[PDB]
């Protein structure tokens, strides 16, 4: 009768109408005589401990909630597949791109950074775009965003950035004062601030936005030659955005606009698609780059590094159970198959450690046993062993020590990583005084036109109006360093707001 | 502007003289640098010897604790309780022992279905939980903004919460589930009528009443027991908001209640609530037309007049929201001598439910958290080692009872009241009970024409998205309540469809 | 060769000699190229975060320890089956006894009460005998002991008893001072103390001891008539015991004597067997019992309540992985199928609440999805849809609320429990003087002969010699109340020891 | 009266005879009326959920156990102080060594590696010697052992070594087969094996053994000049050991021999003492060392690197609660104050990451709020925020992001580390074919005499007799590579044993 997002239970009943309803069992499978009333001493007496069904149900209900992700809590998920359309075997030996036509199952989670589990979808926020590839050589987690860059470039400032973006520790209120204080004290965030406050900041659903790995990745081919690559997945449905008033109205109407849109589009046969590209940079070009090639704030221009098509991402399956397949899913950037490796990108290096720790915290030590996280296209044969909530044979009676003389699993020499000589001094290097203005200026002048610049300035001024006077002055100084037109228009809008 | 916006300026001015403290790690080792990571060369990989980076990242990775399964979105405050009248005849508890006895309190305001990132101004019953720090230990009065509840049997609470919350597959709200449960359980008609009225969306936490909603037993020094209700009525006046204003406030600031409470407390506008009771004797409990322990039944003020007890004043904001509001736990089983529980099935179920979820959400030793500590009581027992054992594990005291070495001893005075019951211990079907007359009286007498019209409009607006047969069942229940109720609701639904 | 326990890895290698050694993978299935050395900059340089395999394996190593059971930590497990031999369908309608010859899979765990995971098997301690039945009506957990009785009779004293049996809170040393202080202050433990310090207190392996449910259970047949029953499983291998010197010597030589003995006996075709009996008591007989029929410190004499054979317990399978099948197993006495229910036995009522709580703490909220704990002979269907490490499909998109109009699982009236009318007053009743002497006197006089009495007195005196003078005097007073011969022999031995 | 280890409770009662016994309260401080009987309807009725005190007590008892340490589970603890006796300010700028006479509180935990919680003290095992210093610059954890060296030299093999030392995954029994298989496949463990099977392998209590940091630590003085140092704490009570028969007898009598000995010695005014030494090595000597100066299997001879006294360790206080002060204590080697830093020792680098992870696992994310782990001699201010069991004010309303313009805590420039130029290709370097024989040979010939070598061979043969033939042959080949006398004596003893 209605759209698929509301007829879920009617569809379930139609699907399971011929068969009889299952009997009501306890946790241990004991059938339940009654589940409407509790055992009491007469009509008006106290409760009995002997109500094992009540105790079981109440205890399980008391433990429903697991810790939410520290970032990207609110999200929507889907399942699909990946198809290779062109040969990039000259760059990487990974089995994902081994030949043309090789389908590969994938899982995708869309999310917002600062939004909590009960927040609205249509808000001004960078969007999370996490893709998991189920491959015969284990799982590969491409955890990207809807933006090629990020706010900061050094890992130790990520918790401070998240704290500044989140609620005030005392009042529990979202605070543009902290937001703009951090943004002005770290001027490298100007590029991402411009990207977020442009019209692309509030996309019209998850099907109308691009995805970027944002990191330079290392591709090793069969000969051992290594190149540096970027990852872009571009939507085939077209880029579409929403206005501020429309975003606020959608937020007040339905906070789950993105989830509902994705669910309906998938259930109506309107499968969203993304085209997979790469940008390959050689070692020589990495040495001769005008900036740091591994800088998270920098992009690679399309003129010197043209996009090369690789494959296509199609999402064609809604999650059966949201908690089972979306809430419990974990993306580990360290999960990289042979042929793809990490670069000296400091942010990526920090992410290599950050994610498994929080996954063990919020999902348990054995979270890789969860079906959505399992590499079911492979076998996990190693010397890892006993853990909390270990529902596996625990690899049976196999030896749990290595090396051994009893035919236990053995390492494969071909999986050894690429080696690069690194010369220098092991110390902390100050990098806040780097170049932060030229790419932002190029984006503002060349990429943006008059109306988009006006909208960007209006959005920045509207968000910054609630900050303190000196914070606004510092932000204005940064914007003026970017461009005098930027700074002057922002100052004028702020002055009329005051 | 508001003090909440000027929080950091206030914090800076609070020192105004002291230089910034040194930056230490978790173990107190001073930090040489906290802006850059240790790398080999300008463009090299990270090194594991960055102990400060590993510590900060690991602590950041574990910042989130599980949210409460219900009443997740909350606002808290601290204050005190003052006794204004003598009710020592009914109860011997030291909270009401004498007039003028100040007593520290802590309260939390919350919404039932609202998750952590949700808007305050939403049509939802409001949580009003009060904790009393008393020399006889802590007392948790976990009330609501309504004198009643939707259901009356404990085993249906998880089903009700599931129906109120997201769809398991689509993760979307389902009025289909909400109204299916409401129509299949007609006892929720009274609370539904209360919620879909003007009082459903209050204008801040300072403009709503609080109700324990349960019949409690008061035992005096002689052992004579009575049944009592608890009402705390706002002295600031009852204030409500329209649906358009509620939606606009939700779109503007989801934390309107938190901000309003914070500003009112910080501006010297301390909210107050007047404490009352409704005492019922044993015989009147036998002569009550309905079940006196029914959660869907109130006691009319004509036969059970309100009698003032004290006043609740909130005059302090939380210093740290996570430390004093997120980590606070309210256990209804925490009852001092002189107050006990009744055979109210819902209360009996809560007595077991709350400590379990507190041990899950905060940890086995959650009573060692400062906000949950009974710092007016000298705790001494035989409970021992647990995860994050905190204070002293009670030292070298014997950990078994009884013993011959002067370990803590039970005192006979704290013995509970003894009442005899007769009957067969079995499950009793109590869904066919009376559910109509109190709702009918509230609709006809308490409300007027415009309030009934608004109530019907709100119910129709919420119910229009349900399926046809669910709407028909709900309409039949409303017609059973009153033909005019049912007919107006059905007309509005037909216009909506 | 040697015992099969020592040849485990040789057997494993012989079994897996016809198959290629598995490749070494990470947690996510990524193949490992070098698991012998860490990534270092140069030969003598610092470690780099890039060792994703090192971090993952070390993190899993850091979390392999789950909390040990608060009691019965040291354990040995086995798997087998239960065969019905006779007809008891007149007493209970449970499908576990429905027909003759109906095989039923079982799992058992043998344990000591006060022993930790690192302690010796051959010590003086009541032995745990927990049996799990996998039945089409869900799992049934018969959690018995090697003694028909217990130390106490009121559940609020169980933590105090365990504390007195365990280490001193300050010195972390065993304290017979606290042991005998609690024993003397609780005279009801005299029967259990006599049983424990008799010859059968130190059994020679788990195959040479009996098992007792120790509780009166309610059996409901198809007509609704309810009787009270006991459960006895008697070893077919014979009752064999060990001396104090031999027990100490075996403890010194090998702390895992029981585990090794059970493993070798099962692996050598020496399947241990236990014969299953019941002791049925009617409502009128319970009303006319000389003592409390529900008292945990009282037995039912075989003359008035003859044992009726039911079936046989055979163990014929060793655990494949000890942690997976013995450490992670959980026995819930509340897991009772229809036809068997609990009695007003206060200890049993307390256990009904105690066990699931500690299981959720020790394993986790979803511990029933662990394969050893799954009711794989039952089709579980309920409305519990959440949990840390949700491992099945979370029952898909089925409605999570009850009642409903969409064909969700429904309760069946046939599982409704038995109802009795209990008259009285709801209050605490002091029950410390329920004739704690007559059964102990009867046992000591009739069951034990002169040499066994002498050995029992020697054992009690040897254990009590380290207590204080007043504690010894109180214990001697209790033993004299039991019998003057008991008291005089114990006091003479104590005076010789002091 | 007996010794304090048994008169604990009597002394506790004597200390509190002149005060009324405290009332019995619940967890929330509500007084308890009756903690001896449960509330039941009538004399013989079912239990009722109204027993809030019973539910609280049972629930807290059900969660009494925390996960045991993956290694060094069985332990004994004590508290004392550290006194500086000489001037080492030229090597390090640490305030712990700042000047002479500076008393400093310390905490010490003694433990066995493979021993589990319920295991005997007198067992052949390397002994743990962990020292925590409470200083004004935070806590310093010197986590050493009773041996200057270790079994292996590469971090990734530590879990395999622990698995080989611990119980069989299937039979849950100890396996000398696994032990000697790992030992023979890793010949670098020969030095440590000789040390462990020498006479000092089973010390007579914790007061009669030395302690070694075993790692080369780097000391930075005020000028930034860095040196490499070792740490030795040598007992002033004398080195005393026990025979195999005596160790077995002590194990069968009392498994807590070490704990009891330490407790009695401290309570009787017999304070044990250890003298603090260092071995300083310069950069040039490290470059010219015949072996790897950072190798965990190599020592520094006293002729070239003489010991230089620093201070004294005195333990003069028993714990007042074993769980509160010994079980909950956590030692983090990364907790190093300014003036002391780590070296490129791979094992130390691995420990720096390993320890905090397992501490957060087994004690909770906020385990530094536990009083024994708190740095109460230093003031703590940082941007770490909300966690489970936040047992402090959570630093109030201070800003939770850095940098900021509101006077939040600031980094101290003088605490910056020492930078050393490091060159070489970032890759895994094999460390198995290194030199593993000459130091063991020197120890065997010079340090050991005839009877000591005979005892060492007897002990090794007694342990190795139960291994397989090929494992024994490989071990014999390793011992022959060490010395022909070693190999021939071991093989002759093995042939006599078989
Ligand atoms: C069988 C019936 C009920 C059950 C099983 C139940 C269960 C729960 C649970 C599990 C929590 C979470 C506590 C926490 O996470 O800290 C909670 C909180 C709460 N409940 Fe209930 N509840 C029931 C009925 C009621 C009733 C009748 C009222 C009011 C009259 C009520 C008012 C509240 C409030 C205000 C909170 C907020 C606690 C806080 O702010 O920390 N609930 N309840």
Residue numbers in the entry:
A (entry chain B), C (entry chain C), D (entry chain A): 4 to 501
B (entry chain D): 5 to 501
From the publication, what sentences describe this entry?
In the first case, we selected catalase for testing. Although the crystal structure of catalase was previously available, the structure of catalase had not been solved successfully by cryo-EM. However, after cryo-vitrification of catalase using the HFBI film-covered ANTA foil grid, we observed a greatly improved distribution of catalase particles with various views, which was further assessed by 2D classification. After several steps of single-particle analysis, we obtained the cryo-EM map of catalase at a resolution of 2.29 Å according to the gold standard threshold FSC0.143. The corresponding Rosenthal–Henderson B-factor is 79.3 Å2, which is small and indicates the high quality of the dataset. We further analysed the particle orientation distribution and observed a nearly even distribution of catalase particles with a calculated cryo-EF value of 0.80, which is significantly improved in comparison with the cryo-EF values of 0.24 (thin ice) and 0.59 (thick ice) in our control experiments using ANTA foil grids without HFBI film coating. With the HFBI film, we determined the high-resolution cryo-EM structures of catalase and influenza HA trimer, both of which had a severe preferential orientation problem using the conventional cryo-vitrification protocol.
To solve this bottleneck, we developed a cryo-EM support film using 2D crystals of hydrophobin HFBI. The hydrophilic side of the HFBI film adsorbs protein particles via electrostatic interactions and sequesters them from the air-water interface, allowing the formation of sufficiently thin ice for high-quality data collection. By testing six different protein samples, apoferritin (480 kDa), glutamate dehydrogenase (GDH) (334 kDa), catalase (240 kDa), influenza haemagglutinin (HA) trimer (190 kDa), aldolase (150 kDa) and haemoglobin (64 kDa), we show that the HFBI film can protect the specimen away from the air–water interface, solve the conventional severe particle orientation preference problem, improve the quality of the cryo-EM micrograph by forming thin enough ice, and produce high-resolution structures of small proteins with molecular weights as low as 48 kDa. In addition, we found that the HFBI film adsorbs protein particles via electrostatic interactions and that the particle orientation distribution can be regulated by adjusting the pH.
